[PDB]
Structures are given as structure tokens and as C-alpha cells.
Design a protein around this ligand. Sequence first.
Ligand SMILES: NC(=O)C1=CN([C@@H]2O[C@H](COP(=O)(O)OP(=O)(O)OC[C@H]3O[C@@H](n4cnc5c(N)ncnc54)[C@H](OP(=O)(O)O)[C@@H]3O)[C@@H](O)[C@H]2O)C=CC1
Lengths: 379, 379
Amino acid sequence: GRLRVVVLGSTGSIGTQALQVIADNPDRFEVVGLAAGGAHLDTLLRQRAQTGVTNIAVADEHAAQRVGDIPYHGSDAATRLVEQTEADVVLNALVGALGLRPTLAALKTGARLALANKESLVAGGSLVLRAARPGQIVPVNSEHSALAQCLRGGTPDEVAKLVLTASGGPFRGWSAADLEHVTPEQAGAHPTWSMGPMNTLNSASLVNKGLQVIETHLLFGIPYDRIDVVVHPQSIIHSMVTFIDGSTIAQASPPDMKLPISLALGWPRRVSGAAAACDFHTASSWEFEPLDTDVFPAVELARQAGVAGGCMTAVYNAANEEAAAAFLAGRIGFPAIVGIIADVLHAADQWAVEPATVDDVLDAQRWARERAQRAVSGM
Amino acid sequence: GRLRVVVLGSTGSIGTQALQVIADNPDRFEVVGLAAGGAHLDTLLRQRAQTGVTNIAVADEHAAQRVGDIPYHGSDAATRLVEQTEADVVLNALVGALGLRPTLAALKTGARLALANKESLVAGGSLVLRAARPGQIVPVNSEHSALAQCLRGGTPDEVAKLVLTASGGPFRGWSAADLEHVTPEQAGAHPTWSMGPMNTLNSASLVNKGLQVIETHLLFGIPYDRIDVVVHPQSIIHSMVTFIDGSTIAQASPPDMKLPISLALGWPRRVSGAAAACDFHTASSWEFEPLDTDVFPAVELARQAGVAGGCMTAVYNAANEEAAAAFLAGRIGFPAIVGIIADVLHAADQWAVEPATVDDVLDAQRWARERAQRAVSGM
Ligand SMILES: NC(=O)C1=CN([C@@H]2O[C@H](COP(=O)(O)OP(=O)(O)OC[C@H]3O[C@@H](n4cnc5c(N)ncnc54)[C@H](OP(=O)(O)O)[C@@H]3O)[C@@H](O)[C@H]2O)C=CC1
């Protein structure tokens, strides 16, 4: 009853939290593989030494050289590790487009895919879906973990609406006027979670929410007009399902990713002590407010891309990555991230064709990146 | 397929709401029996005329003299109607001690029992539990209904805590000094057309919550030390379950008893359009604060009684019935209600024996009422 776990992106936030869950629960889990990029070698060496796992992939060839003895090195190291390691669960916590091929490799093996890497579902679309058995993909993000728990509240035909919650970002309440003046560091701190410069920016622009709506449709098969977003500044309620009789079932916990991680690794079984529970011996308040879809149209823009289907969500994602890098570099303003997403989706006519192979997906992203660059060039 | 329903207590708040749900859903339910006390004989005869159901019971023989074609009249009329009617669901929405035998009769038929009658579990306890098969009893109360929905979020083994919500009453936040000046009218006592004087008062005193804690223990088999109460003034979250991993699942809806009534009737199948869903288009907040157990000790007393066991919860409730009536009759002050419950309970250890018959329960109750009357009068 012990699950063999491959951890991809082991040195990041999710990767390290997942290793602590596995360390705490040797009854339930064992690490059998680690993959990293090569940029934090001290962490990875520390992880090799602490877990005793030598079955390691490192993307950067130079960093893998620097370390020596690494059995998998290069841009396909993570994919090859997954292909050649027997495991029950593959945790994909890699960042960006490079999570796609290791996602596809993992699905092919039969292992449960515990998915933090959103880009692989968002961009992979039906390519990833065709490769997956029912229930094989288990979401790691707290919103989707919340949804999966809440769906147990009824049969599938009893689902009326999925309700995703959003923190609302640092600029909740701000008008369009004052969104123009946002600096790369004003969008650099998140109220409840501590994440990377990209992932914290995606919370500020509401594109992380947009992307999660896409993932929600792809994970659970609920239509886009039945997936709602509500602003909940506290991030204690992580999501809800409303049923056909009027009942809403909600999931709540203090923000700690170890909870959704442990549940994604152990699914369907809950992992005793994974995280602290809500304390009802002290006063608290859960506030909800409607999202401002005029100032923050990134979610509706994600529905539009999602309804168009095929490779259009790959376009929505890839356009974001490029426009976001331009923001962090200092080349474009804050509102220009979503404005450029809009302009790129409007030109992306051809990319509504369903992908047959990874290259179709790769072809759409290439186009979107270029088109996104051309839009940046114009300002 | 269609469920045949017997409605006991048809002329009350729950019973009439249940008949509305049955009338809006002829596909799901048909009424096959109706039982009332006699005080609202006119309502029952209009119900007979409206539904076409002639299979009716009237407890009051004197009131039954007015009609001449009631197949079941007198004492145990409701019990006899239960024994002699083929049904799939018995809704027991009878008030007080006269709900206990129809509950037992209903369990013996092997029909599902939708239980609103509090005395069945609070007084009848082990008599009712030993007579019931697993899943046979489905609760009608909004809190218990919330708990049953939330328990879907994991296995029985995965439960850490049940958390009942409480409005806190009209004297939420009041000091012990504040409570000294409490009048019957302040405690929500008005000549309301369906609201019994007791249930408003039991909510103001926190005895309703005590009673619900006792029933939670018996319905769900969770230790008293793992059943909590949080104050929640909005009454949108109707109760919650905390699981062993630290995740809490909560049930939420705008107050409307037709939701938990519909689900109780159709269990485990939800009833489309039963009640309005939470609306997140407009801002709101769900507030939680701990209960001040020094000013409001009624729930800890309920746990004391329930742990003591046997007929002690019967004593708890009868001692309340008497004390609460005396406060309404201006013979005692508000704080003396729960004060008097403590004193009767402290002197009551002889009733910690398990009841063998309905009579054992009646004897305990008789004792508790007399002992409480003593305390009221100064004897
Ligand atoms: N943290 C959170 O709570 C949330 C996470 N997510 C999602 O989780 C995913 C993971 O990001 P997060 O853990 O949060 O990330 P981090 O940025 O903290 O870490 C990402 C990991 O990917 C590795 N990596 C980077 N480049 C490569 C590459 N060239 N080849 C192989 N591995 C590489 C990194 O290794 P190294 O740095 O050593 O090079 C690192 O271990 C994201 O897609 C994000 O959308 C979603 C919602 C919130």
C-alpha cells in the first residue's frame, strides 16, 4: 500500500512541500525520482542526500555536468526519467510549456498524474485528455482540489455550477485608470500565498484565474457558462459546487498547499495531519464579492478561448507568457498583458483545429509567441 | 421512480412545507398517509379534500367526533396508520412525546424514516437506535442535513470533527449581566401563527443547539468531544465537517427548510429546484465567532447528559421544557432556565440506565419535570 512517487520540479515550492509530505508519510509514499532545471543545485543536492534518490533528471546540461553522475540530462531529461522509472504517481510540478511532454509521458505509463503544471492541460487540451484514463489526472492546485472534494456532495447530473474563488489580487477594487501605473514590484506580493514572479503576476492580472477556469472545464467537463468566479479576499474557501436543489458544498482550510498536495498524491484517501484545520475557536470572516469583469476581463477572455477550443487555450497561455515576460522586463505596462491577450486571440482564427500531435500544440504556441511579440513591438 | 410518503404532523410547519415539495414534484413523491393532532382538524380536512388522501389519522378523539369518517382516531392513531399503510418514506414531523411510538412503528415497517421529531432521538435514544438499521433514519433539520451532505467528503474513518453552526440567538454577545434583564418578548416570544413559543426560546437559550448536539451524536456516531459549535449569525453555512487531513467541507444556502426537507424525502437523491442557491453576484460575508460557554453553558450540559447516557438526555430535555415554560410564565428569570437544567441533571444519575421500553423514557421525563417544578417554585 506504499505509492512510488516521481517528483518533477522538485526544487520549487510545490516540489519541496510534496517532499515534506512524503517525508512525513513513509507509510504512504516513497520518492523514486526527482527532476529539476539546474538553477538551484544546492537544493537538489540536499534533496538527493536527504531522500537517497539518485534517479535524477536535470534540464540544464552544464548544471548536470557541474553535479556529475546525473542519469538524465538535457531538455528531455524529465520526460525520459518518467518513461524509465516505475512509479504509481507522477507529480508534475514543472513550470511552463516544458511540463507538456512529461505530462504525456506520465499518462502513457498508467501512473496517476498529480498535476500542478497547468500549462500542460491548458495548452495540451484534448491531446492530454485523449491520453488520460478517467480519474488519472488529479489536480494539485487548491481550487481544483476543492472542486473535486465538493463534487462528492452529489451525483454528476446533480451539478448545477462550479464556483471558483479568487483572492482578487493586489489590485482588487482598483479602477482601470490606476492599473496603468502598476510596477513589476507592486504586482510582486500576494496576500495569502508565496509564489514565483510569474505565478504571483498571474494572480494580479487574473490570468491565473482564467487559466484555472480552462483547467476546470478540462478536468471536470462542465461547460464554461456553468463555471463561475467569485472574489474571496481571504482565500479560506478554495472553491464550491452548487447543486440542482440549491445546496452549495464548499471546501475550506487555512492556505497551505500541503493539503491539496497530499490529497493529490493519496487520492482518494486523505492524509492524516497534512495541514492545520480552520480554527473555529477564534473569530473569522469569509467575504465574497463579484469580480469586476470590466477592469479584469481575463477570465471571460479565457472562456472565449476555451469555447473556441482546439489550440486556442494554448494561444491564450503562450500569449500570456510572452506579454508577462515583457511586463517583468519593463517593456510594457500592466493593462497591456490582457490587452495583448485579447489582440492575439482575435487574430488566432486558424488555431481552433484540435491537435492531433504535440507538434500541433507546439505550432500554435510558436505562432502565439510571435504574434504576442509583434503586439509588444507596436507599443 | 415514485416514493410513497406518509406525512405525520401534516398541519405543522415542516409537514405543510413537505406537502408543498410533494405537490411540486408528483414524479418523485406521492402522499399515501396523513396524521395530525386534532387542534388543526380543519386544515387536515382541507388536506384530505386537496390531496384526495382518505388514509388519515387524528389523535384527538374529541376532535374526531366532528367528522365521522376518520379511519384512524384516538391515541396511537398515527402508530396504527403507520403499521397499516404501505409506504417507502415516513416523514415524522410530530411534536414531542407522541412522535416516539410512530418512529418505532415506522422503523419496524422497514420504511425510510425522514425524522423531524426531536423526542425520538433526544428521549428515545438507544430504543430508537437499536430499532433502526443503518441509513434508515434520514434527518430533516438543516444542521443535521448539512452534516449528512458534508460527510460525503470522506469515509467515516476520515472524520475528525463535526461543527454545528448556531445563529447565537437574539442575545448573541450579551454578558451574564445583560441576560438578567431578559423578558419573554425579548426572547422572541410572540403569538406567531406557526412558530411554537418553545423553539424560538430554545434558540435564545442555546438549548436547541444542545439538543442538536445530542442528535448529531446519535445520528452520526461521533464522540461528544469531537462535536463542536460555532456561532454564525448569517445562517448561510448550516454546518461543516473537518476531516483528518485538515480539510473542512461546509454546506451553504439561503435559509429555506424546503431544501433539507426535499433531500430528506428523496435521499440520497437531490430534488431539482427545491430552494434558491447562494447568489454571489452581490457582496456578503459569512462570520464566525466562538460561543461564550460561560454565559451560554447549555451545549456543554447537553454533552454532559449525552456522555452520561441512557435516559439523561430525556432528563435534559424535560427539565428544559419545564424551566422554559416557567420563564415564559414570568416565574423565573432567563438565566435560570439553563441553571435549573444543571441542577436537575446533577441530581439525576439514577437515569443513566439504558431504557428497555417507552415507559422507562416516560418515567425519566416525569421525574425531570417534577424536579424542575420544585426548583422553579422554591421547593
Ligand atoms: N505554488 C503554488 O501554490 C501554485 C502553483 N501553481 C502551478 O504549479 C506549477 C509549478 O510552479 P511552482 O512549484 O508553483 O513553481 P517554482 O517556480 O517554484 O518551481 C518550478 C520548478 O520547475 C523546475 N524547472 C524550471 N525550468 C525547468 C526546465 N528547464 N526543465 C525542467 N525543470 C525546470 C524548477 O527547477 P530549478 O529552479 O532548479 O531550475 C523548479 O523546481 C506552475 O505551472 C504553477 O502554475 C498553480 C497555482 C499555485
